[PDB]
């Protein structure tokens, strides 16, 4: 009854509400519907914590030791959390921000939230806005409908019993059809102080909550939401990074979940590099986690079934635990013919490498044409047209007797003809492929290039230098050609990502021609 | 009534079919009363902007009567007889403290407020009046006068200033008239040789033309070929030349079956190397054999012609009733020629 | 019975009209006959709760002191001249007529220019009550007009809830994002001085008097607003700020507020004007100070960390060490071509994020039966048609000027507008395309620091364009010293601040011959 | 579980092993420990609304059956149960192996046995009628009268060509 509120610091308006609802409760009689609906209303109103904050430890070094020990890498998230702690110290009060991590699947966006709430000692709640289409799942129903529930944030405040509980909203890319309004008001510093749930009319404060959001790509998020939160990039890992993550975090966790311990089941680091290079193709450690779980589960069975008293997974018997090595190519061409050139692409899942093939379409050396296939977007077809024009101009100025590309009928294809692809990059790639076909020369053998081209030959910047460079390193390239204006993007990469890479920053195509031949 | 929601759950425009039945109003059955109520003594008045959005069974029960817009003179009368006095009653000013002379109001209508309604004129009037009130109550003045020179200090910069792209027409352009919501509008039809020689010719059109207007261009091109063949059988222009036709202001989309005669005249003037009469607008749908067919929006086109300084207007002969139903001040100084076939337009324009 | 007294007491400080009093008496006498357990009693008590929580005569005591309100406005925002002048005229009129009043305004402009915060500042300056009301993406009319008492989940809609929350009958309601409304025919009634005095909410079933509410709508564009709704409300432009205004805003409002938000002191964290100019010029590219706020907050956060953690006792940010806080510059190019080849010309464009500079490149598709023109660069249909017009006029002009060139009628040309991923549109760049074609044909380059904008017609006339301010700013920023504008944009250009048109040798033109004699 | 309608958060809380020990139901005010019950859930597509379920739910994929496995299933489990349901027995109505392979190959090609079950029930109902009415004191189904029981074959010869001319080549879909 009224004892659930003597520990709470109840506001005045909600005090009037609970008083008038107590009057209604007392005037009504038992075993009646109205009695029960008022009972539920008052129970919900007296279950909300109206004045309490969780004791938040603003100690810097302890929180840094907490964060740095349960998650590898991810410097941006930890730096932002430490600055958050510093600002909370200076302000003297417990404050709240709105953050958003975006990155490929399985890079720690969800577990870093839990470790963060453990560091700040706040509570923790998670709920996904993925498939929801009606706003009553957040704002709640109304007290009049036959089945009435107060939503999914009042439930947070009730079960956590706090006013700053670090709500994590997973997967805000997926949104039905628009609850984005309720989302924004929930994620707005001007609409947070008063929330006004639908079930219980009285508003509640949310300006102390720490809203963390996780997405895979920023563009599917509504533009209104793309301004009420900061954007921290959680990036994918490399082979050695994945291996460190595996050894230090995945094997212990999966093992302690399966029941075994360090003696009864081991995984040599060579087995882990096998499960990384071949049995997995990703920028995260999700499928790697599944593979390690499968290995340890079969190990647990072989233990309990009495086939062996301890298992040591080696490269010699990994097949008995996972089967055959999918992904045993790692790049289409090993030695490129005169017509094909390696290019770099990227997407939300991470970087990727692709090739641009050219060929003659009719048997000779009335102008030539250029067929283009490969499920290419409109921008990519226009870039191919620009590349064709500039390649003809360049071949005329450099080898005025070739006559190729002027009388020849060419066909240009980008393999994997099933997957669609777009973008203004690979213009320099298309120019290089056409010129190498016209000259009958193959380009340097481990070489990838990325960069937009213009009708006069200038090389314009591109995007996603980090992921493209990761993919080029993984595909085993030694040289790489970039636009000169992406130097600042390239030199933000860690020192171990750009070790065996010979880099060239160019402004005009003549430099790319000098490099590729 | 043209804005009722036809939602997935609810179509009230079908429940109106009983409320507005001239014969079945006498027994209108409400679902709460369950007793028919005599509604045949009620004066129902509906208001709409567009008539086609009302279902035909419903549109048949009403007596649709039209409330047209206002020409400049009607707008000046409305202003100085209802808007300025009401604006003064609102902003609490007096006739003696800020006077909006008829010259200032005429200029304000001519340059700023051009649509059919009288709702933007109200806003400009009370803008002037509230700026005067702020000058007065703040002590910057004890009385304000608004003249046609300091008006731009009150309402800003004019919105309509030119009224005419070409003042003297080259051998390829010809003035046509258009219907707009902001009064009428004047537009020209440019034609140019596209290739360096006077295997047949071709016509390329630009200017954000609708489909009906592109078809009108095709028909006008064919008839222009035929007419120039019967008239000057040795010209050979329009038969082997590659023409480009452009209706300038290439950003705004324009449509309609009019400007047939305009396009024929443009092509013929380009072929003969002659400019048309220097103050001559024309409008009319042409057919494949040359017949000039009626058009719409005669009031607006005539207003725009008279406003752009046109002295000779050409209309189809079947728009004579439309033209002579216009007020006396609209059609007083215009030498109008009504035509049935194109040959008359050709004789007028040359 | 006590609820009868509670309802009859709420209408003591109110001056209730006659019809509301009739409805209240009827509903009270009806409530005095129901059973406290039936749903009829619940719905009648809800109706009488909503009927008495309307401020039937309660107005707020507005501040009508022009000087006090001007001082309030001038110390909350910067340079919103038209909005402040409008509110001052509003006060002047309310003072000259002695009674309160209501209007329906619409502030429209690019994002982040303080449209929705000047509303709160105005509500404070006027001593009104402020209510937020978002409409973007709304689809249900029952949010404006409500449902009947009959239905279960029946609320009286947003305006009645406003009147109940603000407790005054002349609040300031900010109808936010009326250009992104999904439903809009209810606003035609909500804000229409004719019907406004008797607004019928479907729940109350008794008309309210919104004739003294100051409605303020915000939008980014006026093209997506229905024509009658634009006809109802008054449009007031809130344009984006130039670099100097952005600097003044950062110095006066953004850095102090971000220090307050980060819990710093002025002595601890300092940002010189050079650092702020560097941020504005290189780390953010938009019209209003919205990303600049984020950059300032980031710098101050990293300063707070360097202090609390124990690095230093004071942080003094310089244009040198600014990298250690926000990283490397993001927009440090300012121009693509330094010396234009014989076939490229610099044009001007603009968007809601300010103005831009783009070049029109041309070249030969085939060596040395007529010519063709292939255009690429993600051009809209208007831009492609302008390219066709420009091609035809360039052919004719070169025929009349150099009759023996034979270019432009026998050559196959490719025309490109770089940044091939960016969609472009608009009727301008006609003169730019004509100049590109003629320069490629004659083998000559254009003047070296020259930008031109203007729509061309089929006979060579230069027609007016839009966004002269933004194009001029972008040309000045890109190091342009000669700008060629249409003659009918002369007043648009001369109504610009003196510090924009300072070192620009401007030329106003009507026909293309003048542009040709300039550019060559 | 993917045909569920708030029941989503209710299940999400129920399956949780930290809220498992205290499951207070609205009828019994007394809590009950459910930390010893074993929960299994089945579905057809993993495109249901809650993603944090799939974080706690361990997905296992039950693939289809090639024709041999379907025939073995039909001979061992399906036909006995259908006989039990129709009241027949192996002496009265017999379904040989070749007729079952024919039935699978020409009528039921999906990944499950939902269609083959209805087909064998159809055969057994026709057989029950034939033995009760008196057309035959015992029925023997054979690949030359199965259509008299199930109607026309659904699938066909599967080879448009037997010997390919110079132009045509067989691909697989
Ligand atoms: N001239 C100015 N003076 C002071 N502050 C300003 C000014 N312009 C913008 N701001 C600041 O910008 C911040 C946000 O601006 P606001 O959200 O009002 O922009 P907006 O135009 O409403 O954006 P949107 O159209 O997306 O709603 C406010 O904190 C405000 O202080
Ligand atoms: B480039 O950076 O623009 C690049 C060119 C690529 C087609 C060789 N495009 C991409 O990488 C796109 C993403 C994108 C970039 C820029 C604009 C629009 C889209 N990714 C892909 O095309 C792709 C295709 N298959 C697999 C992975 N990624
Ligand atoms: B005509 O009367 O059809 C005319 C042809 C004009 C392009 C020379 N068209 C218009 O008047 C149209 C309205 C219309 C009337 C009748 C049928 C279809 C359309 N208006 C415009 O074309 C226009 C032109 N410029 C600006 C705005 N509107
Ligand atoms: B012009 O004013 O028409 C201009 C031509 C430009 C492509 C050289 N176009 C634009 O300025 C458009 C805005 C616009 C104006 C008029 C009608 C429709 C649209 N801006 C852009 O195309 C643009 C492209 N990239 C970056 C920024 N802006
Ligand atoms: N640095 C890391 N240390 C430990 N675990 C990691 C790390 N990076 C990723 N993980 C693993 O990734 C998984 C979480 O991925 P998540 O961020 O949920 O991806 P998504 O939400 O995009 O599917 C966890 O199993 C976690 O163990
Ligand atoms: Mg806004």
Author numbering:
A (entry chain E): 421 to 597, 602 to 789, 796 to 947
B (entry chain C): 592 to 789, 796 to 947
C (entry chain D): 415 to 596, 603 to 788, 796 to 947
D (entry chain F): 592 to 596, 602 to 769
From the primary publication:
The human mitochondrial AAA+ protein LONP1 is a critical quality control protease involved in regulating diverse aspects of mitochondrial biology including proteostasis, electron transport chain activity, and mitochondrial transcription. The LONP1 protease consists of an N-terminal domain involved in substrate recognition and oligomerization, a AAA+ (ATPases associated with diverse cellular activities) domain that powers substrate translocation, and a C-terminal serine protease domain involved in substrate proteolysis. In mammals, LONP1 is a primary quality control protease responsible for regulating proteostasis and various biological functions within the mitochondrial matrix through diverse mechanisms.
To test this prediction and characterize associated allosteric rearrangements, we determined a cryo-EM structure of substrate-bound human LONP1 incubated with saturating amounts of ATPγS and a 10-fold molar excess of bortezomib. Density for the bortezomib molecules was clearly visible in each of the six active sites, covalently attached to the catalytic serine and positioned within the substrate-binding groove, mimicking a proteolytic substrate. As predicted, bortezomib association with the protease active sites led to their reorganization to the active form previously observed for bacterial Lon. Importantly, the protease domains in LONP1Bz switch from the asymmetric conformation observed in our substrate-bound LONP1 structures to adopt a sixfold symmetric organization. Intriguingly, we were unable to determine the interactions between pore loop 2 aromatics and substrate in our LONP1Bz structure, as these loops were not as well-ordered as they were in the substrate-bound LONP1 structure, suggesting a dissociation of substrate from these pore loop 2 residues prior to or after substrate association with the protease domain.
